[model samples]
Target: APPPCRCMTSSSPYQEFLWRMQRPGNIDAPSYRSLSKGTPTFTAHTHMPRNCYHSATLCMHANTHYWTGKMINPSCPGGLGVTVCWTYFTQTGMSDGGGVQDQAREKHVKEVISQLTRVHGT
Candidate 1:
């Protein structure tokens, strides 16, 4: 989960908007850097309008932005570290419709989940 407060050193409306868009619908996911060896995990997610999702490209860009810098790569000290944060984001997602881009997104989600599993657990 993200820290309770955010004080970004850099400001970008584009980034801010993207951050809002990436805000997940759920928040019970395991913290990135858990102190315990075993912590029950959950997934976080955001949705985009079908029209705005131009292929996997645009959708992915938004996902990357929110799940990356906003959740990860910040120098702040009060939250789970970025690596584990990214892992949680990668572990969730499925393609809802049939299309080449949808296939790609599905594949991407699968691959990401696999990577997280390998790094974390089954």
Candidate 2:
């Protein structure tokens, strides 16, 4: 049996973004499966730098690889009976510091979505 979906939420937009990127997959391992259905858990990492206003950089790495909503059904022997479907969703970030440009924020969000889609495709 696979693990339940873990939805993460944060009061800080920047912190939430970092959290999502750092652990990009559902938590089905360990005792996550046994957890109550529809119950989401979060582990905050304040150590992560949330100073995007200063860095102006985003980190996308294999360690941050994850997809929401469901798994790939096991492929048939010899890869004959393979059919899969994945739900499409998007995550958006908002700037509150009044320093980041709106246009840049939109572009950055689009890039993040594109990267996520590309990774999910494989």
Candidate 3:
């Protein structure tokens, strides 16, 4: 069985973003399944410059390197840095044969982008 989702609330916007991504029913649902079986867990990293009041960066790297989420500081001016979170699933390292469909990946990324825009604005 898959591990329970690791989503949780946090004060940092980046952390919150990750929490939302990893929430139960999200696209990476099965990743948690392997995680439950002693695989290395998904990891999130935050980059915030000292004395910068505007925003921070967040990057989530799954254990298998097939999934990653990069969130730019939404508080930045002009929103110059924006990237849709992405995932590439395969059977070898991350799964037990079979793969995630391209359309599904696109849909998931679109939803992630949409949610980020909704929460943080353009």
Candidate 4:
């Protein structure tokens, strides 16, 4: 079974955004949607920098040696850095023919690392 989603609040005004952002479809792995638009979800939640840090780890139901919800934001302006964090969930517990999809996922992780120094695709 796929893991239960503990990455997001069970219910919040911002629920759908967090819920969508964590998923491969919305975050758009190597297909290159770039986690770009949904960055606003952080400010709408009024999350603090510390809250941002914890939530980076929070987006993980990955529960594997692989990383998810890794924060890469160098420093948020006014220290409102939540916009820079990323939740890069791997396609674990699924089939592993190790095909292009998985390779695409690797590209996704690479782009995420590139997002480290900038936000909003900066």
Candidate 4 local lDDT, 7-120, one digit each (tens): 222233243344344533344422223222432332212222332243333332345322123233333211222223222433454432443334446777788987975776
Question: Tens digit of lDDT per residue, candidate 1, span 1-122?
Answer: 33322223213334333333344463444342432233333222343222222232212222342322222322222122322112112223443345334454677779999999999965
List lDDT for all candidates, in order: 0.34, 0.32, 0.35, 0.35
Q: Under the 3 Å rule for N, CA and C atoms, how many clashes does model 1 have?
A: 0
**Candidate achieving higher TM-score, 3 or 4:** 4
Per-candidate TM-score against the hidden true structure: 0.22, 0.20, 0.20, 0.21
Lowest summed lDDT across 10 adjacent residues in model 4 is found at 76-85
Tens-digit lDDT string for candidate 3 (1-122): 22222322233454335544654356753333322233333332222222212222223343422222223444421122333222343222233222232333466779999999999974
Off by over 4 Å in 1: 1-96
RMSD of 4: 16.9
Error of 1 at 77 (Å): 47
The regions of model 2 sitting more than 4 angstroms off are: 1-100
| Candidate 4: C-alpha lDDT | 0.35
Query: How far out, in Å, is residue 120 in model 4?
Result: 13
Off by over 4 Å in 4: 1-90, 93-95, 118-122
lDDT per residue (tens digit) for residues 1-122 in model 2:
23332433333444333333334353533243332244333322211112221222222223341222211221211011211111111223433343223444567779999999999999
Residue-level error in angstroms, candidate 4, position 53: 41
